[PDB]
Amino acid sequence: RKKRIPYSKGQLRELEREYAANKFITKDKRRKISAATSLSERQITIWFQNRRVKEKKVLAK
Amino acid sequence: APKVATNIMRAWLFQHLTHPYPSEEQKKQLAQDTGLTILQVNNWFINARRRIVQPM
DNA sequence: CCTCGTAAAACTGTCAAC
DNA sequence: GTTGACAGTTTTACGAGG
């Protein structure tokens, strides 16, 4: 498995702009954002998966 | 304490500000010549990042 | 991709402590 | 002042299963 290598505070800024716009990603933007952030097309596809769970975590109560 | 330990682990940090994280293979080598546990190196690096880097 | 759950790196948050 | 340490919570990254 790939070792834990968290992301720059500027990369998490690129995301959460998009996530806040749409909770889901287009294969277009799945590319467009990846190049600017130099993230893998795979990884960015995982970030939303996790980030989605987070919003259900905020559910509260 | 100890001292030189700190002086070792400060050298590695200031060497890479870019990527201030070790590979578990590197940490092993740090633990290998420190006298410190792997846990201690992890813990210290965890501190050192919030202890030092943030203003930088 | 997609919850959902499960590892394991790395973050708070605080603390007596020497 | 800040150093080392820790339970508890957050972030990364896969794999089952539908």
Residue numbers in the entry:
A (entry chain B): 217 to 277
B (entry chain A): 279 to 334
Recite the paper's sentences.
We also generated an unseen test set by solving six structures that represent several TF–TF–DNA complexes bound to optimal DNA sequences. The structures included two BARHL2 homodimers with two spacings, HOXB13 homodimer and TEAD4–HOXB13, MEIS1–HOXB13 and FOXK1–ELF1 heterodimers.
The first algorithm is based on mutual information, which enables the identification of TF–TF pairs that show preferential binding to particular spacings and orientations relative to each other. To assess the feasibility of predicting TF–TF interactions using currently available tools, we collected a test set of known structures that correspond to protein dimers (MYC–MAX, CEBPD–ATF4 and FOS–JUN) and two DNA-facilitated dimers (MEIS1–HOXB13 and MEIS1–DLX3). Recently released versions of RoseTTAFold (RoseTTAFold2NA v.0.2)39 and AlphaFold (AlphaFold v.3.0), which can predict the structures of protein–nucleic acid complexes, performed much better in predicting the overall geometry of TF–TF–DNA complexes. In predicting heterodimers, AlphaFold 3 succeeded in predicting the overall geometry of the HOXB13–TEAD4, FOXK1–ELF1, MEIS1–HOXB13 and DLX3–MEIS1 heterodimers; RoseTTAFold2NA could predict only HOXB13–TEAD4 and FOXK1–ELF1. Neither program was able to correctly predict the contacts between FOXK1–ELF1, MEIS1–HOXB13 and DLX3–MEIS1 complexes that contribute to the composite motif formation.
